[PDB]
Every structure is written in structure tokens, then in C-alpha cells.
Amino acid sequence: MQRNTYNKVGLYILSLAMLFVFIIILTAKIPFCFTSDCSFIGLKKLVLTNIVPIVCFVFFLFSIYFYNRLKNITKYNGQDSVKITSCQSESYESLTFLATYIVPFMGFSFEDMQKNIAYLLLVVVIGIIFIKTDKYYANPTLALFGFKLYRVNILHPGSGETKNLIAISNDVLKVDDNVYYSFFDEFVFIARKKI
Amino acid sequence: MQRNTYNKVGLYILSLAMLFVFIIILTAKIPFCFTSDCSFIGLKKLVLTNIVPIVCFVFFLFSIYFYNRLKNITKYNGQDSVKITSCQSESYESLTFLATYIVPFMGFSFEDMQKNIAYLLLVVVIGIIFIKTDKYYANPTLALFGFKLYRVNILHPGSGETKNLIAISNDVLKVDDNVYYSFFDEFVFIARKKI
Amino acid sequence: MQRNTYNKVGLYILSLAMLFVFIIILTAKIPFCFTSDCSFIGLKKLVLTNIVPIVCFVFFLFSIYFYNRLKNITKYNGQDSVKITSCQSESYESLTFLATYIVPFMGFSFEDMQKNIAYLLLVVVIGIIFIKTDKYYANPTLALFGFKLYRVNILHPGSGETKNLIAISNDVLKVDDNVYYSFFDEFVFIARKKI
Amino acid sequence: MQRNTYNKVGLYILSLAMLFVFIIILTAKIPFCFTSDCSFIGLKKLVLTNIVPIVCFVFFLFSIYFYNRLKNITKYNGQDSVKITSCQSESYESLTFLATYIVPFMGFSFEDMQKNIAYLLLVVVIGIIFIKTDKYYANPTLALFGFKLYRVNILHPGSGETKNLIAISNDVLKVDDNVYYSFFDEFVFIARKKI
Structure with a gap:
């Protein structure tokens, strides 16, 4: 706990960024006007009537920060390559997230606070x-930014082959390719596809 | 029928505890009056106004009782051990259940009695x-409390191997691991790691 | 086409009986009056305000008729036995059908006719x-009445090993049992579990 | 990028035709009154009160145009045959595109423009x-028009065999059921079942 649990929570808050921008688009009661006699009501009632866009805004900056902390693991290391023996695509496992865990929150109505x-x-x-x-x-946010989630079986030059790893990649991968690695956990690594 | 059906119904009522607490939070309609004008309006119309959170409260105590009756399985004889040959982590169930059979009840409007x-x-x-x-x-209520559901293929020292069992384990298991069992039914056993 | 398509349409109309029951329970605005002031409005207004319960009632009788036409095929030719060689329980397809294709109809508002x-x-x-x-x-209506849907590969005594058949059964089956067949199509047959 | 991405975007716009038909049926505020005092309000406010039927109408013609291009990909070539080794039906992957991605759109209320x-x-x-x-x-729109989506493994007479192809076809297929290809991408081809 408290390291792997925090890493997985930081992956989960990244997966909800589309939901936070959806709620901000959905239930923001902003007075969109262009007339002369529609002047500023004040910060008090504007803050009070827009409580859930403010909370979803704070969570959106948290998702941006956790995306930065995800890119910080491909910053440092990763000048080592492996070989993929069996690559099966699992990008659809991202999209069913958007099918099931996000769109019911679009379906709800955020009027009463209870x-x-x-x-x-x-x-x-x-x-x-x-x-x-x-x-x-x-992840909807990772798979939206070009990344594809693959199920690979890497083979190291000196150690051996490790089974059932999950590769977040920036480009398409196939059987008998050469990718780099930067291991997030013992399950998920970011590939780079050495040409 | 009966006893095995009652055990499965007792597992099902445990699976709905999050739904009952969601309906209690959702449609409670309790007078929460910080003002001095709102006094106690009376117990009779407070009971008559809150019907569905009272019924969901009774069902929540039923889920608590069935959780206690699930823990009574591991209270008694559980001092054998087996060996694990396959450990397919089928813990994605109790999450498709949560967003396919509990989430759609949250969007309904519990106003009219029909x-x-x-x-x-x-x-x-x-x-x-x-x-x-x-x-x-x-079971979302079981998977909340640290329990992970594994598809497992155990092997006994004296009898043999039995295929396709389900282990509600407290901690992570893997291939070639020693667990202590307590068999709830012929398909599901509560397992604890021996270490 | 035609006859096989009509049999599949009959199975589908059987699969929607619980939806018609749910709509009849949901949106029938019957005037349930115990008071002495609520007289009969008339049969015309009771019919015109309850149009979609009437339509769902007619469809419910169609589902009952197609259940009768499904139950007609266990009568006429069931004096033969086969052996199951690989049984895998596929009774969760009915529950995914119920949770995904019938539950979202319950949340719609059946007021405007468009x-x-x-x-x-x-x-x-x-x-x-x-x-x-x-x-x-x-099928939710078939799996409600004790029937379990299995994926079996029957073995005939003198014909062969026709694989990938779907068995609707009244009781539990496993490997190496004898079942009485009554074929609906080239895919679905009703088993009987010859003791 | 570009052309392959444009072909996949065309297939996706074809996949959404039933959604545009459902929205046009749902939220068109057309004054369907046969009364004598139901004069024309005017074209301007008829346009302004029906903004989202107009937008979904334009998208429906875009889906019709992309269906025309999908027929143009089978107009020209397609005078060579292969042999099928492993046919597995995958038409249900069409239907889960409906009930999870098009069904929850109609539960929304298309009233406020935000x-x-x-x-x-x-x-x-x-x-x-x-x-x-x-x-x-x-595809809901393709599977509506008789097309079935199978997962086949074709075998060429002179080049060899290729694994994991997706066949959109008009009639039922099986093993050794020679078909004519009209390849769309490196994944999806239109079969024709040379008799």
C-alpha cells in the first residue's frame, strides 16, 4: 500500500478527466450575455451557483497533474529494448470504460446537492x-491521446521472457517488434517502438 | 433447492448493499434545517414521507446480517491447505455488476409509488x-472490503485436483501458492494465504 | 427465410415479456379511488389515457402465445437420447440481455407519443x-422459469459428434449425462435429463 | 493517417445512422395538427425551433454518402476467390454497439443547448x-441491411493463408465456403459467397 495504491489511484484520476470536462460543459450556469444591461452579478452568487463546475475543475487539474506524473516515468529511464512474442490489442477495454462508467453521469441531473x-x-x-x-x-484520456493499450509478452535478451504484460504505446505494435520500456508497475509499461 | 438457494440468496442480498445505501442517500427528504423556523413536524408524517429509505434501511440490515452469516463460514473448521495451479484474476466481476445492475437504479426517480x-x-x-x-x-460489498475473486484450480495432497473453483481471497494469490480454505458452497470457497 | 425467421421472431417476442410487464406496471395511470367522489369517467377515457398499457398488454398475450408455441415442441418427438461430452454454462447471456436491453427502457418517460x-x-x-x-x-422469460441455457456437444450412438449446440434444460447438466433432445432449430434444443 | 483514418471515420459515421434517425423522431417539434386554424407560423421559427433535427438530418445524409462509398468499394474489383478455414460469427459485436452507445443517448433530454x-x-x-x-x-446500420460480420481466416490458392480477417457479408458462411473479396482495409473485406 501507499506506493502501488497511490500509483493506481493516480492512474484512475487520469481516467476520469473526460467526465470532469463533461460535467463542466453540462451544468455550468454561466450568464452568457452580450448586452449593455447584463452587468456582473458578483463573485459570491457566481461561485455559489457553480459549485460542481468548481469541484470538477479542481479534479480536472488533479487529472492534469497525474498525467504529468505519468509522463515523468518515461522522462528518466528507458534505454533498453525487448522483443514482443505475442501482441493482442486491448484498446477496446478503454472504450467500454466510456461506455459504462462515465455516460450514466451524463444521464443524471446535478440539481439537488444530496x-x-x-x-x-x-x-x-x-x-x-x-x-x-x-x-x-x-483509460479514455490516455487512449484519446494517440496511445494504444496492448497485451504483450516481452522477451529479454539476457533474463528471459515474462508473460502477460500491458503496453501503453504511441504507435502500432506487432509480433516480433522492438520496443523500449519504462515500467510503471509490474503490469503496465510504456513502449516506444525502436525503428 | 432451499438450503443452496438460501445460501445463494444470502450472497445476492449482500451484493446489493451499495444500492441500498445509494437509495438512502439519494431520496431521503429529511428536514435538515439550520434555521430556527423549521421545528419537528412530527414522527408520523416523517415516517410517511420517508418510505423507500426505510425499506432500504431494513434491506441494509438484511445485507449486514448476511455478511455476518458469510463470516460464520470461516469462523468454523478451515484448517486444511491446498496448492494453486491456476490463478486467473476474475475480479473484474463486481465492477460490471456495479455499473450494470446498481448504477441504472440511481438514475430512476423514486417519486410515484407504481x-x-x-x-x-x-x-x-x-x-x-x-x-x-x-x-x-x-459482489461489490465483498470487493469493497479488500476481497479479490479469483478463478482457481486447486490440488489436494491426498484426493487429487479439482477444476474451476472460485476463491474469495483476502490477499493476492499466484501460481504455486498455499491457501487455507473454507467451502461456502461447491463452487465458492473463502481462502486465506498461508505465510 | 420465413419459417426459421418466424421461429427466431417468436423467440425474441418471448424474450421481451418482462419488458411488457414492466411497462404495464410503470405507466398505467389507473384511477384507483376508494373515495365516494371518484366515479367512473367512462371506458373511452380509460382506454384513451392507457394506450401504451393496452399495446403492451396485446404484446404480452403475444409473448404468452409464443411461449405456448415453444412448449409445443417438447410434446411430439422426444423418445431419443444423446450424451453430452462438454458442457459450459452460458446462462449469463440471459442476464446480460435483461440488464442491457430491458433496463434502459424502464428509465424512459412514456408520456409524449413521439x-x-x-x-x-x-x-x-x-x-x-x-x-x-x-x-x-x-431469454429473461425462459430463464425465469427454471430453464438454464448450456453450450453442449452431443454424442449420438450412431450418427456422430455434432458440436456447438445450445441446450435449454430444466435441470443441471454436466459431462457424461444422457439427455432427451427436441430440436427447435439447428442450434437450440430442449434437454430433459434422462435419469 | 489521413486516408485510413478517413475510411475508419466514414465507417463510424455509417455506424451512427440509427442514432440520427432516433433523434429526428424524438425531438422534432413539428406542429402535426390537422386543425383549420393551424396556419404556417413561418419558415424561420420552424427552422429555429428544430435545430437538432436539422443537424441530425445533415449527419444522416453524411451516413448515406458513406454507405454509398462503402458500396463503391465493392463495385469495381472482386473477381478472385479464397477458401475459409475458421469461421466464427461476430454479429453480436454489432449489437453491443447499439445497446451501450446509441441506446443511452435517447434517455437524455435535448432541450437546453449546453x-x-x-x-x-x-x-x-x-x-x-x-x-x-x-x-x-x-455496425447497426450494416447489420440492419442483412450483412453479417464474421471472423474468418482465408486461404489464397497461390500466396498462402492470412489470419484474423473480418468479413462483412450478405449470406451465411461456414468452413470451405469460397468467397470473393473486395478488401476495404487490411482487416475488413466484403464477401460474396461464390456458389
């Missing part, structure tokens, strides 16, 4: 079950 | 099909 | 895709 | 993830 406490508890419970599930690599 | 009778009938029909569907081990 | 035309078009389009989708045996 | 901007962003995001998701052959 229902918002219920939806926040649903997000927290989905996170706690999602941490310990060995499917935490599913 | 609609509540329809939702109760949906819960009953989902339960009747879920008893005999070979996937009754999926 | 929306009702849209939902009827969704039912028709789901049926047209569901006839030819190779998974037409999924 | 919510419509959110739903359009959801369509765009589902499209961006669905291009690279390796399951882009899923």
Missing part, C-alpha cells in the same frame, strides 16, 4: 473497486 | 435470474 | 439485428 | 477513441 453527494460516493466506490481489479490500465 | 413497485419487481427478477446463472460470486 | 414511436422503433430495430445475431437464445 | 454541446462532444470523443479501437467494424 444527489450530488450520492454521485460523488458512486465515483469513490467505483474507484475503490477499480483499484484492485487488474484492469486499471483502461 | 414506479417503486416496478423497481422492486426489477430487483426481484434480477435476483431470480442471478441465483441460477453460475456468476453469483460477483 | 417518444413512444421512437421507443417502438428501437424495439423493432433491436429485434431485426437480434434475429440474425447468433445469440438469439438469450 | 447539454447538446456536451452530447456532441461525447459523440466526437467516442468517435476519436473508436477509430483506433480495433473493433471499428461494429
Whole structure:
């Protein structure tokens, strides 16, 4: 706990960034006007009527920070290559996330605050079950930024072959290719596809 | 029937505890008055206003009781050990269950009573099909409390090997591991790692 | 076409009986009056305000008739036995059908008639895709009445090893049991579990 | 990029035709009154009160145009045959594209324009993830028009065999059921079943 659990939580908060921008687009009660007699009402009621865009904004900066901490593991190391023996695509495991765990929150109505406490508890419970599930690599935000999630079986030049790894890659991979690595956990590594 | 059916119903009522706490949080309609104008309006119309959180409260105590009756399985004789040959982490169930059978109830509006009778009938029909569907081990309330559901293939020192069992383990298991069992049913056993 | 398509349409109309029951429970605005002031409005207004419960009632009688036409095939030719060589329980397809194709109908609001035309078009389009989708045996109404859907490979005494058949059974089956067949199509047969 | 991406975007716009038909049926505020005092309000406010049927109409003609291009990819070539070694039906991967990605759109209320901007962003995001998701052959509009999507492993008479191809076809296929190809990408080809 407290290192692998925090890494998986930082992967999960990245997976909810599309939900936070969806709620910000959905239920922001901004007074969009261009007339002369529609002057500023003040920061007090503008903050008070826009509570859930403010909270989803703070969570969106948290998702941006965790994306930065994900790129910080491909910053440092990774001048070593392996060979893929069996690559099966698992990008659809990202998209079913967007099919199931995000669009019901589009379906709800964020008017009363008690229902918002219920939806926040649903997000927290989905996170706690999602941490310990060995499917935490599913991401709408990562798969939206060109990355593809593959199930590979790498083979090291000197150690041997390790089975059932998950490769987040920037380009397409196939059987008998040459990729780099930067291991997030003992399950997920970022590939780079040496040409 | 009966006893095995009652054990599976007791596993199913445990699977719905998060739904009952979501309905209690969602539609409570309790007077939360910080103002001095709102006094106690009376117990009778407070009970008559809150009908679905009272019923979901009673079902929540039923889920707590069935969790206690699940823990009574591992209270008694569990002092044997086996060896694990396959350890396929089928813990993604209790997350498709959560967002396919518990999340759609959160979007309904629990206002008119015929609609509540329809939702109760949906819960009953989902339960009747879920008893005999070979996937009754999926449990959001169990997977909240650290438990991981594994598809396992055990081997006994004296009898032999038995195929396709389900282990509700407390900690992570792998191939060639020693666990202590307590058999809930002929398909699902509570396992604890021996270390 | 025709006859095989009509049999698959009958199985699909059988698969939608719980939806018609749910709509009849949901949106029937019957005037349940115990008071002495609520007299009869008339049969005309009771019919005109309950149009879609009447339509779902007619479809429920069609589902009952197609259940009768399914049960007609266990009567006439069932004096032969076969042996199951590989049984895998596929009773979860019915529950995924119930949770995915019937539950989202329950959350719609059946008030404006244009929306009702849209939902009827969704039912028709789901049926047209569901006839030819190779998974037409999924059924909430059949799995409610004790039937379990299995994937078996029968062994004939003198004909061969026709594999990949779908067995609707009244009781549990495993490897090496004898079952009485009554073929519906070239894919789905009703077993009987010869003791 | 470009051309392959444009072909996959065309297949995705073909995949969404039933959604545009459903929205046009759902939220068209057309004054369907046969009364004598139901005069024309005017073209301008008829256009302004029906903005999202107009947008979904334009997208429906785009889906019709991309269906025309998919027929143009089979107009020209397609005078060579292969042999099929392993045929597995995958038409259900079409239908799960419906009930998870097109069904929950009709539960939304298309009244306020901010919510419509959110739903359009959801369509765009589902499209961006669905291009690279390796399951882009899923189709409600194609599977409506008799086409079945199979997973085949063709064998050429002179070149050899190729594994894991996806065949869109008009009639039922099996092993040793020679077909004519009209290859769209390196993954999806249109079969014709040379008798």
C-alpha cells in the first residue's frame, strides 16, 4: 500500500478527466450575455451557483497533474529494448470504460446537492473497486491521446521472457517488434517502438 | 433447492448493499434545517414521507446480517491447505455488476409509488435470474472490503485436483501458492494465504 | 427465410415479456379511488389515457402465445437420447440481455407519443439485428422459469459428434449425462435429463 | 493517417445512422395538427425551433454518402476467390454497439443547448477513441441491411493463408465456403459467397 495504491489511484484520476470536462460543459450556469444591461452579478452568487463546475475543475487539474506524473516515468529511464512474442490489442477495454462508467453521469441531473453527494460516493466506490481489479490500465484520456493499450509478452535478451504484460504505446505494435520500456508497475509499461 | 438457494440468496442480498445505501442517500427528504423556523413536524408524517429509505434501511440490515452469516463460514473448521495451479484474476466481476445492475437504479426517480413497485419487481427478477446463472460470486460489498475473486484450480495432497473453483481471497494469490480454505458452497470457497 | 425467421421472431417476442410487464406496471395511470367522489369517467377515457398499457398488454398475450408455441415442441418427438461430452454454462447471456436491453427502457418517460414511436422503433430495430445475431437464445422469460441455457456437444450412438449446440434444460447438466433432445432449430434444443 | 483514418471515420459515421434517425423522431417539434386554424407560423421559427433535427438530418445524409462509398468499394474489383478455414460469427459485436452507445443517448433530454454541446462532444470523443479501437467494424446500420460480420481466416490458392480477417457479408458462411473479396482495409473485406 501507499506506493502501488497511490500509483493506481493516480492512474484512475487520469481516467476520469473526460467526465470532469463533461460535467463542466453540462451544468455550468454561466450568464452568457452580450448586452449593455447584463452587468456582473458578483463573485459570491457566481461561485455559489457553480459549485460542481468548481469541484470538477479542481479534479480536472488533479487529472492534469497525474498525467504529468505519468509522463515523468518515461522522462528518466528507458534505454533498453525487448522483443514482443505475442501482441493482442486491448484498446477496446478503454472504450467500454466510456461506455459504462462515465455516460450514466451524463444521464443524471446535478440539481439537488444530496444527489450530488450520492454521485460523488458512486465515483469513490467505483474507484475503490477499480483499484484492485487488474484492469486499471483502461483509460479514455490516455487512449484519446494517440496511445494504444496492448497485451504483450516481452522477451529479454539476457533474463528471459515474462508473460502477460500491458503496453501503453504511441504507435502500432506487432509480433516480433522492438520496443523500449519504462515500467510503471509490474503490469503496465510504456513502449516506444525502436525503428 | 432451499438450503443452496438460501445460501445463494444470502450472497445476492449482500451484493446489493451499495444500492441500498445509494437509495438512502439519494431520496431521503429529511428536514435538515439550520434555521430556527423549521421545528419537528412530527414522527408520523416523517415516517410517511420517508418510505423507500426505510425499506432500504431494513434491506441494509438484511445485507449486514448476511455478511455476518458469510463470516460464520470461516469462523468454523478451515484448517486444511491446498496448492494453486491456476490463478486467473476474475475480479473484474463486481465492477460490471456495479455499473450494470446498481448504477441504472440511481438514475430512476423514486417519486410515484407504481414506479417503486416496478423497481422492486426489477430487483426481484434480477435476483431470480442471478441465483441460477453460475456468476453469483460477483459482489461489490465483498470487493469493497479488500476481497479479490479469483478463478482457481486447486490440488489436494491426498484426493487429487479439482477444476474451476472460485476463491474469495483476502490477499493476492499466484501460481504455486498455499491457501487455507473454507467451502461456502461447491463452487465458492473463502481462502486465506498461508505465510 | 420465413419459417426459421418466424421461429427466431417468436423467440425474441418471448424474450421481451418482462419488458411488457414492466411497462404495464410503470405507466398505467389507473384511477384507483376508494373515495365516494371518484366515479367512473367512462371506458373511452380509460382506454384513451392507457394506450401504451393496452399495446403492451396485446404484446404480452403475444409473448404468452409464443411461449405456448415453444412448449409445443417438447410434446411430439422426444423418445431419443444423446450424451453430452462438454458442457459450459452460458446462462449469463440471459442476464446480460435483461440488464442491457430491458433496463434502459424502464428509465424512459412514456408520456409524449413521439417518444413512444421512437421507443417502438428501437424495439423493432433491436429485434431485426437480434434475429440474425447468433445469440438469439438469450431469454429473461425462459430463464425465469427454471430453464438454464448450456453450450453442449452431443454424442449420438450412431450418427456422430455434432458440436456447438445450445441446450435449454430444466435441470443441471454436466459431462457424461444422457439427455432427451427436441430440436427447435439447428442450434437450440430442449434437454430433459434422462435419469 | 489521413486516408485510413478517413475510411475508419466514414465507417463510424455509417455506424451512427440509427442514432440520427432516433433523434429526428424524438425531438422534432413539428406542429402535426390537422386543425383549420393551424396556419404556417413561418419558415424561420420552424427552422429555429428544430435545430437538432436539422443537424441530425445533415449527419444522416453524411451516413448515406458513406454507405454509398462503402458500396463503391465493392463495385469495381472482386473477381478472385479464397477458401475459409475458421469461421466464427461476430454479429453480436454489432449489437453491443447499439445497446451501450446509441441506446443511452435517447434517455437524455435535448432541450437546453449546453447539454447538446456536451452530447456532441461525447459523440466526437467516442468517435476519436473508436477509430483506433480495433473493433471499428461494429455496425447497426450494416447489420440492419442483412450483412453479417464474421471472423474468418482465408486461404489464397497461390500466396498462402492470412489470419484474423473480418468479413462483412450478405449470406451465411461456414468452413470451405469460397468467397470473393473486395478488401476495404487490411482487416475488413466484403464477401460474396461464390456458389
